[PDB]
Design a protein around this ligand. Sequence first.
Ligand code: ZN
Lengths: 344, 140, 62
Amino acid sequence: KIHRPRRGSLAYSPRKRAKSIVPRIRSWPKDSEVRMLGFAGYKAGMTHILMIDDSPGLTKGKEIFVPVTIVEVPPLFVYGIRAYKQGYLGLETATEVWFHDLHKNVARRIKTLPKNYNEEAFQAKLGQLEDLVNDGEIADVRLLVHTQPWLIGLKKKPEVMEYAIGGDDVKAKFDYAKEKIGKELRAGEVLHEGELLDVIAVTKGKGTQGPVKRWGVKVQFHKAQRAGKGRHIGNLGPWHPARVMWTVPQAGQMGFHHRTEFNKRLIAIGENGKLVLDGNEIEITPKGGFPHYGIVRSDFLMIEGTIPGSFKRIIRVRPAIRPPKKKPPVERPQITYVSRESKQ
Amino acid sequence: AKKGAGATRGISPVRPTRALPIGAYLKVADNSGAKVIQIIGVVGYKGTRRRLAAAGVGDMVVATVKKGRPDMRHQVVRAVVVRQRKEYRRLDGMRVKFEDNAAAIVTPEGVPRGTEIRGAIAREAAERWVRLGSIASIVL
Amino acid sequence: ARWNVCSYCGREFEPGTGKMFVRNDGRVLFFCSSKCEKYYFMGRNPRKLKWTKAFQEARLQR
RNA sequence: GUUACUCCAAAGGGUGUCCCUGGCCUUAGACAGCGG
RNA sequence: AGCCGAGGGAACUCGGCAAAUUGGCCCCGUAACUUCGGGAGAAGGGGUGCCUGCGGGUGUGUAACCCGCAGGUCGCAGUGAC
RNA sequence: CCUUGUCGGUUAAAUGCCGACCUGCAUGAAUGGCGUAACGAGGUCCCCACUGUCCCCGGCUGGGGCCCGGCGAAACCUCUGC
RNA sequence: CUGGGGAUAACAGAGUCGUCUCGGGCGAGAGCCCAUAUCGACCCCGAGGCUUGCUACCUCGCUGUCGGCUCUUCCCAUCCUGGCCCUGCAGCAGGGGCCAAGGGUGGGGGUGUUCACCCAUUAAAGGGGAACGUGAGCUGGGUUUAGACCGUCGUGAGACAGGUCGGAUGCUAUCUACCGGAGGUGUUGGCCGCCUGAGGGGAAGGCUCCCCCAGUACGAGAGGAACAGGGAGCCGCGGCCUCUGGUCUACCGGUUGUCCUACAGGGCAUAGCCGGGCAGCUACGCCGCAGCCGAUAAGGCCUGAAAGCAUCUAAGGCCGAAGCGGCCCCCGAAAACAGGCGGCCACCGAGGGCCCGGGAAGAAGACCCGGUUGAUGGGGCGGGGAUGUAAGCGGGAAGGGAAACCGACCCGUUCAGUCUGCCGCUCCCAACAGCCCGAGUGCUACCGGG
Ligand SMILES: [Zn+2]
C-alpha cells in the first residue's frame, strides 16, 4: 500500500448552480454597537498599492506590495422594517411595514406594489408595530433595503435584501430602524476603516468541466493518452458494494457557486471616485478606464486581496464572524503609492 | 540568550520559489575541490505521491560530487543554493534573477568549507546563512 | 515608492513592476518588460529604434 | 437474556449477590484507642 | 489528427515507447581494429544571403555552361520556406 | 540445481553489464571446437547531445461529439428490474 | 479434431484448522540479594480464518490471468501525531502497558516481480480487508499455444512442475447506479417578492522547524529539559488576474521559393518560417482557512458505607483527550404538521411566456441585462493600448560609366502607418410588429363575528 489524501473536498457538495445570483447570508455576527451589520455593492476592478505594513509579524514597519480590489457602493434605500418572533422550531416572521414613497424602478423587481397607502396609514402601521414591540412578543428586528443602480448607469432593476442589526435590546434596535426608515444609507455611516470583513458572492461560471479540473485528479500514463483514457479516471469502484459511490469524482458543473471568504481587510473608503492622501486627491480609476467596466463616479471600498465574482456582479459584505486574536488595528494604514496606470 | 555569541543561522522575510528539483546539476561557486554537483535531496522537505523535492536560493540540499579533485569525487555533501535563473519576488514587488544556478558547499551545522566565493550571491542566502556573506565580495 | 529606469528603452517604470537582471561580475540591469529583456538578449540595437531615447541621442550624434 | 434442534467459546478466577452446611470463638470476642 | 510551452533534463517506464535533436554544398581534419579491400560521411571544426565590381576554362563569340577574388550592406536568424 | 556463487570495476544506492576465479547438478572438437575484420528494421549494457517521458500539467488549430432539417439499419431481447 | 462431463482436477467462493499467526493459566528459574521493572522453560486452555495444506458442496466454453498505473471506501491487532500508568524512571533518553483510528505514513537503485535488500531525506516514512477491491478503466514486462536454440533424458517420433529470443487485448448501454442539467403534478383559488431552516454533508484543517524561557532546573561531570509567549514554513482545501511567466491560427512587423508583367498590393507553401504581442484562459503567480463552550474515555481525586478502622464506588460528587456534540461553511419548502410574512388579482383577467437588441450565463433547456419614459448592439468623434516609423516625394550611397544615368541600402518628411474580441460622448441606423397561456363550481362538519 501507498497512502495519500483524497482528491478534492466533500464539504461543498453538491456542486450545483447557485439558487439565486443575489447571495443570501445565513449567519450574523455579534456586535455590541447598534448598527446595520453589512452592506452591498458592485465589483469594479483590481490594482495594487505600496504601503507600510501594519499587521503583526515580521515585515511590520516595512514597505510592501499589496493587491487591492475596488467595490463601487452607492447608497442603499431603507424601504421596510420586519419583526421576528419565536416559533416552535425556530424564528417566524410576525409583521412587516413598508414605506409609502418608492422609486418608480422598484416595480421592475416587485411587480405588485400597494396603491393608496398614504403617509397616515404608514404612521398607523408603525404605531401598531411599536406597540407590538413594547408588549414583549418580539425576538428580533431587521431592515429591508434595496439598491439604486441608476445613479451609476449600470441598470434600472434593483436588488432587494434583508439585513440584521447589532446589539441585544430589541427596543433599541427598533428605535434605530425607526430613525433610518425612509432615508438613504451610505457605507461610511456603517463601516470602519481597518476592519476585517467577510465577503459573499457567486463565483465565475465555467460550465461543464471534467475531473482533472473539477477535482484535481492525475492525468494517466502516456500509453492511456494514446488509448483514449488520458483525461478519465480509472474506475468507478469495487465489485462490492455493487453500486457507484457518490464520493467518486465525476464531471459536471464548475463555477457559479455560493461562497464566503473570511477576513479581508477594508483599507480605505472613498468619495465621488476620489481618495484623499496627506494633501492631494487622486482618481482611482486607471487611465483608459477599468476593463469590462468604466469609470467609478460615486463611492467605493478598497478591500485587500481577491474576492469571488465577475466584475459587474453584486457583492455582499459583513463584519468578520471568525476573526483571529492578533488583529490589525482599526485605522487606515499609511499608503505611499497607488497605481493609476493602464490595465489593458 | 543561551548562545548568541557566534551563530550560524539567520532569518529572511522573502521565501523564494522552489525552482531546482532532484536531478539538477549545480556549478560550485566556492574554492573547494568540487566543480559540479547533482542534487539528491532537499533538507527539511516532505512531499506527496509522485512529487519531487525542490529547492531555491537559500535552501540546504544534499548533493553528490560529479567533477572535481579525486578526494571529493563520489562524496555526499551538504550545500546552500546561492544563485538561480528563475525569477522570484521581493517585498516591493520587483522580480530578481541571475545568470546561472550555483551552490556553495557547507557542513550540516552551516559552516562553509572554503575561503572565498567567486561572484555575486543573493541577499536571501546571505541572510539565512550569516557566514557566507563574509566570504562573498558582492551581495544582492 | 521610487521609479526605476529601463536599461533598454530609457523610460521610467512604476513601482511594483519589472525586473532586475544580475550578472555574476556584479553589473545590474533593470527591465520594464519582457519585450525589452528579450530584445536586449537576442541582440537588437536600440540606437536604431525611434521608440527609444538612444535614438534621439544618436540623432544628436549625426 | 428475550435461541427445543437446523444456526450459541474454555482452562482458570471473583464469595458480586441469594442460599445449605461444618469447626473456633462470644458477658466480652475480630479492631480502635491511653500504657507496660 | 496537429502547433507552442517557464525552470529542471529520463527523476518516467519492463525498456528513452513516443517525441525531440542532426540535416544540403565547400574547405580543414579524421581513433581503435583490419581478411590491407575497408572501417570513414569515423569523430570533430569553420564558412554559406543581397548589391557593386574584377578575373579564369572551353569556345569565333560581352552566344551559352562551369570555376575563383575583393569590397559595401541588412537582419534574432542567409541549405532563412521546401 | 544451491544462486542475487565469490573477488574486482561501473552507481549515493546494481537480483543488471563487463573482467577474473573453477565442485563443468548436466561444456568440449565437422549432431564441429576456439577466434574473427566487414555486415544486421536481430538480442543486450553504458556515455555525449536532445527533448512535455516525468515533476505538473496549461493554452491554441482543424475534424467529430451537441442542437436543427432530411435518409434510415443492426447486435441483443423468459417476464421484469432500489 | 469430434462428442460430452462440475459424476472429475487447476481458480474465486463454501467447509475445516493439523500447520500458521496472535494470546492466556501455573511457575521451573534467570535478574548483587528480590518469581512477576524485563525475561519466562516444560505441561495445560483458547481466538482468528490475511499462511499453507486437507475435502470435493457450486461453476467446464460466466469471467480463468500475476504484477504495476489510476480511483473510492472500511477495520484496528497504533509507526507518528493528542492524553495517561509502572520501571532495574537523576536529566536527555530507553523498556513495558492503557485510552484513542480524527489526520499523516513519502522519494529513489538493481529485478516482470509481491516480498525482501540497499541510498539519501523524514515527526514517522504501520500493517490489513473490499471476487489475493478495481482489464464492458489503461498497460501487457511475466505466465514454455503455433516458430526457433542450448543442456539433459529417451532406439525413435519426442519430452522437461529447466533456461533463453520472438509472439492478435473486441463492444452503437436494454435496466438499474452515480455526477450534474431541465419539464410536470401535488401542497383545496391563482400570482410577485423576502424569509425560516426540519433534516442531510464537512478534515477544512493537519503537521514540522526556529527564537525566547535557559546554558536554567536535573546533575560529580559531561550533557541537558518543561508551561506560557513570539515568528516562519510543508501538506491539504477554497477562490482571483493587480503583479510575474506561458499560450494567444485577433493583430503588427521581418524574410525564403513561386504565380498575379516589374513598381504598389496580394494568393499558395503546417499560421510557409522567424520575432513581438493586448483582452481572455491559465500556474511557474497572488489572496483566505476560530479556538472557545458543553458532555465523556483511560486516568487522577473528594465524601462515604458494606466490614465501628480503612477504602476512588456500592448510592452520590469534582476534574480530565488531535477523539464525541455545538458554534462556522456548502445543499436545503416534496420538511405529507408538504411552512411563515407583506402585496396584487379573483371568488374581462393580476400575472406569465414566445418574439426583438445583447452577455457577466450557457451541450439542449435554464440564468442575466435592455427594449424610444432608451446608450442594448452597430456607426461617427475622441481616449487608452499592440507593433515599430507606411506609401509617395526629396536628398545621399561602395563602385561603374564619353556622358545622360544604374545601384542593394541610408537619412528627412514621420512616436508614423495599420489595427483593436477595452472605455467615454453622441439617437446617425436597428431594439418595429405582434403571437400564445392564464385562476370563475359546490356538498356536507364547520370555525369567529353576522
Ligand atoms: Zn524598456
